[PDB]
Amino acid sequence: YVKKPSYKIVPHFLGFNIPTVSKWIPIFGIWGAAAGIGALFLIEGVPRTRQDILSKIPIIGEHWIREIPASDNPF
């Protein structure tokens, strides 16, 4: 015979609990990647982005190492 139902209250805050949030952790990850890729794409033209980030990527990085010949540069 059972006298009482068996349950606990899980900690919660602003209507969130850990079981639920944990399901969304990976999704925040992918959104973070999406935001990272998007941000980096937006500043791909900035010379510092190329110098510090993009030109350092293996294989691919040579796409961003481009020199104007000194004969063609007024400045």
């Binding site: 000194a70 004969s71 063609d72 540069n73 007024p74 400045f75």
Partner: protein, 55 residues
């Protein structure tokens, strides 16, 4: 190549009477001339400087 030849016609014929005031020497560079050729053309001319120390 035609642009470079046309500059030579401008310089030797038209420039006696006509200005080309909106074009700077740097504009020729990498279009018709190298940096060195255009610097040489610029350096042959005299331009007004800022006044000296006595004004």
């Amino acid at each position: 190549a035609s642009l470079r030849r046309g500059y030579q016609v401008y310089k030797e014929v038209c420039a006696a009477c006509h200005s080309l005031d909106r074009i700077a020497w740097r504009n020729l560079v990498g279009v018709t001339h190298t940096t060195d050729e255009a610097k040489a053309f610029a350096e042959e001319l005299e331009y007004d400087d800022e006044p000296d120390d006595e004004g």
